[PDB]
Amino acid sequence: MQTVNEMLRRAATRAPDHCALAVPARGLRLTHAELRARVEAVAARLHADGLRPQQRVAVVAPNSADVVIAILALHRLGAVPALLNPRLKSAELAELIKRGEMTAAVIAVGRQVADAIFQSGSGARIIFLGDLVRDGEPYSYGPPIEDPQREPAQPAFIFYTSGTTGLPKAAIIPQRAAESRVLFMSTQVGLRHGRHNVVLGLMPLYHVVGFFAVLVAALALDGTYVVVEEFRPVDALQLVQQEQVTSLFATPTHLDALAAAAAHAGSSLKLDSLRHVTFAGATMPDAVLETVHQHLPGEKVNIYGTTEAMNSLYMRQPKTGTEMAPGFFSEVRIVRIGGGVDEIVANGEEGELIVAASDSAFVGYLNQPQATAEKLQDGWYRTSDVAVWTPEGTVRILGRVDDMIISGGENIHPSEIERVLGTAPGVTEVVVIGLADQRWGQSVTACVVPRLGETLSADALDTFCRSSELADFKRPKRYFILDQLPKNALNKVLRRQLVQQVS
Amino acid sequence: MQTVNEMLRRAATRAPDHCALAVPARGLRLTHAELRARVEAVAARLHADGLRPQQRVAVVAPNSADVVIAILALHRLGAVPALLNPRLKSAELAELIKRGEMTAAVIAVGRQVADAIFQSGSGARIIFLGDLVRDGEPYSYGPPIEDPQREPAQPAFIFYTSGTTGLPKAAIIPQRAAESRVLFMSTQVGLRHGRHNVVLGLMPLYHVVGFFAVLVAALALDGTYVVVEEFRPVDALQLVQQEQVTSLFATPTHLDALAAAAAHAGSSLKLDSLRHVTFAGATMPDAVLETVHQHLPGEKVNIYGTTEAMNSLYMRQPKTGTEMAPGFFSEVRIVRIGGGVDEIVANGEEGELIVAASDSAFVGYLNQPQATAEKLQDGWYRTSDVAVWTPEGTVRILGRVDDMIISGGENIHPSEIERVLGTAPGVTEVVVIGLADQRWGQSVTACVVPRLGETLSADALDTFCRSSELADFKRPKRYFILDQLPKNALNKVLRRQLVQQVS
């Protein structure tokens, strides 16, 4: 195999004096050799402090040059980074770190989260990111350290994704998965090796796209990763021009915002260096696809994928957002919903898209054998995406098998929000749905029934969500206060019908 | 890993009814699904006849759809194909088959070779290719067979390479090597996944370029492989036009011939479909490069590589034939000649190019661990090429460490020809050199001295070479008959003086 460490090590031997990390706002630039030196220094320090290979270490930080260094240093040592969304609140972060039996937690989020981890009794050593590396500069002691033995099936990285109930699942990415999780960017997207590559780091590092397909791929191809700490679409387009960005890979949400900024820049706008605009994370709305086609340059590529199996379908110069086909690495099937992996659907019958679990695939969810058995069956990964084969022989993605909402490319299950809002004073029933939204894809929407003879307020419900343990980004954008909810003859709420009722 | 069998199997699930193999002159076309069926049928038949996984099977045939089916059927069964140049004569072939402990030999080269194999006592079962499959149509019997378990380090394919002495060595290519031996065509050459790929099969299947980088790459990317049975430059260019070929990978020898044909044909040929013109196998002479740039369309890419480690250096749109830099997968060093793998020379000093032995690398020469130890040392493969780092930070390929001649992308050692000509009646002393030649790169040249007072003739010596055990393509293109070789008091040839005298 070629591990992340190996890809980046080899890249640094080929292009030592070429810029690896650019942070234009902070005036920081690091060559491949400089980055390597810093990764080594941070690895040596962690090792001197006692950290061992195969130990799990949480990483909870927004995108920055410092977190890039920390993640790669953990991997260099042989520790398994468990990347966590820094927008999550203290109790959720502490409980995930506890259940993960992690050895340390590198955080940039800082004091209340740190206390939560301590009080949880996990025993994870809390490390402030700024105490490890600051503005690219490590605090190091200790000799150079050995290379850990990495084995193909062995845990390498952990990424989290939402289940239909409970806390997010910890997807274990094996060492062997790294190469294909990078190289689809060559085979599908058409990136090629070279120092010409200038990649805009829009996507979060704590998800597989922002990590493997953006950061690792940029450096592994001997190019430059441009760090973006906060998404501002006007500033982003200015970076494209300023850094001469050649490729950008983002959500339909990002691209709706970018294409709008592009249009608003007027008839003089030129973004000549940009050769690739790639999208993933959610269904690309047709309206967004039109603005992207009309206002941004480069080849447009739709990339369908999952945390668990990475890229499974794609489309170059798509005419619609729903239609894609398997590329290199990939084998796919559409099977009867609820049926076995061999129960392939007829002609144009709808079913669940399932994808072969090969090199790119996760090896299970940490400490969740039941959740794993539901998703990994007879060599296949079950996407929970509804799909159909077209007369053209392509795959049309139609929606979810489950009730998962996808907003800003983030999976949010309605139960997360229903659990919280169900305890808000005055609420007698709550059902949460996703409404079609050009910007967000699906907009989190609460349908709430007040106690008889009482009223409810969208402002008060929103306040309650914000003070709750629920991540702020997940809270409802809109509330519908209703006297009743549509129900079947078994008193279950007709969720899909309700979507049509309030849309 | 992703084995050859998996790449091709997955391709066939994605593009079943797309053309995989085209032989336009025979009117033979086979879809990916049709090819897989013929591969399965041949594999089943071979298993019925007693062939088993990891048994070695020689393949001795020129390029054809039938040998493609046979090689892939052997692999599908789990046998190890050992690909041999069909231009080698019967004694060399039989002895290589014997030395390899081959179970069987699939031959399209006739009864004399069959008899030599039989009489050698090797016990290798002789199989006529045309008795297995002919014009794409298999003779099918036997029940379905299992797809055997394949392991990363397990022998997958054997390819032959010449040493400084003795018979060619059998380089064992492991299962794990297939993927990077294909994917460098994406990262370096810029081929991408898709049915748009129409690849012209110029390169011999019995070397690693023609097999991995041409045949397997074409099919694995869901494209079409256009079979070429016999190279004729005008006919090849007509295939580019007729089949709308998008990529062609060949030697500088091929390209010299093609560029001349294209120059002559001018506007009567429409070559604009051709998007990639790639070269490897020998130093690209600057005069060939110039005419290639002038007369052939598409992006020009020089690929440096070896049987043992595949691609190690490249250059897009090269200005010279000798300067290249490492691409994806590759890590290189230049070390003191005769020194250890850690004895890196100072930039600007000449030394041996060595390349990291990673996933792509062979695992050793069959039954020759001494020869293996000379070439595979502490995780590095030693190329026997002399090289230097340029002030521009690139690698400049110079000569050989070992006197190897490279003619038409074929390695030939002078000793092979010298040992044969030393027995020709009338010959007393012989030195064989390779003279610079635009078409062949190096032209095999024999400097010969007659017995006292006798005469030699180029015609008689040529006749002797042709009737000898030496492969015909290796025989001298030119003879210099001399009264005496220039030699010192030690009776040793003043090589520089000789080359000067005949150049």
Ligand SMILES: CC(C)(COP(=O)(O)OP(=O)(O)OC[C@H]1O[C@@H](n2cnc3c(N)ncnc32)[C@H](O)[C@@H]1OP(=O)(O)O)[C@@H](O)C(=O)NCCC(=O)NCCSCC(=O)c1ccc(Cl)cc1
């Ligand atoms: C679009 C982003 C940047 C948010 O926009 P922005 O930066 O303007 O937000 P902000 O931080 O300034 O706050 C502005 C207000 O918006 C709210 N917000 C934030 N995120 C979301 C969201 N996801 N949904 C709904 N609301 C959101 C946020 O709460 C704030 O309002 P406030 O709290 O009232 O201040 C953010 O949602 C994002 O980075 N999304 C990308 C997530 C991602 O990386 N997804 C892919 C993960 S792997 C998945 C996958 O499917 C896949 C696909 C292909 C392959 Cl090959 C492999 C895997």
Ligand SMILES: CC(C)(COP(=O)(O)OP(=O)(O)OC[C@H]1O[C@@H](n2cnc3c(N)ncnc32)[C@H](O)[C@@H]1OP(=O)(O)O)[C@@H](O)C(=O)NCCC(=O)NCCSCC(=O)c1ccc(Cl)cc1
């Ligand atoms: C250029 C070829 C096609 C020969 O041309 P052509 O087809 O016109 O010859 P032909 O069979 O019609 O007979 C015409 C007369 O030329 C004579 N000939 C044949 N081959 C050669 C040769 N290599 N050197 C000198 N003379 C040659 C042949 O004997 C015939 O005269 P005759 O015997 O009088 O009929 C042939 O030499 C060839 O196919 N060469 C390609 C060799 C090759 O595949 N090399 C790469 C192997 S792997 C090596 C490697 O370096 C690498 C590189 C990159 C990577 Cl990534 C991995 C590995």
Ligand SMILES: Nc1ncnc2c1ncn2[C@@H]1O[C@H](COP(=O)(O)O)[C@@H](O)[C@H]1O
């Ligand atoms: N290009 C795309 N088109 C449609 N849906 C997508 C695309 N990329 C990702 N998704 C959705 O996002 C889910 C993956 O998110 P996660 O479960 O966090 O890995 C997939 O199962 C799809 O529902």
Ligand SMILES: Nc1ncnc2c1ncn2[C@@H]1O[C@H](COP(=O)(O)O)[C@@H](O)[C@H]1O
């Ligand atoms: N692009 C190239 N430029 C110069 N020499 C090459 C190139 N490709 C292959 N070679 C030569 O061919 C040899 C590989 O042949 P082999 O190891 O027998 O497959 C190398 O050691 C080089 O001498």
Ligand SMILES: [Mg+2]
């Ligand atoms: Mg913002």
Ligand SMILES: [Mg+2]
């Ligand atoms: Mg011929």
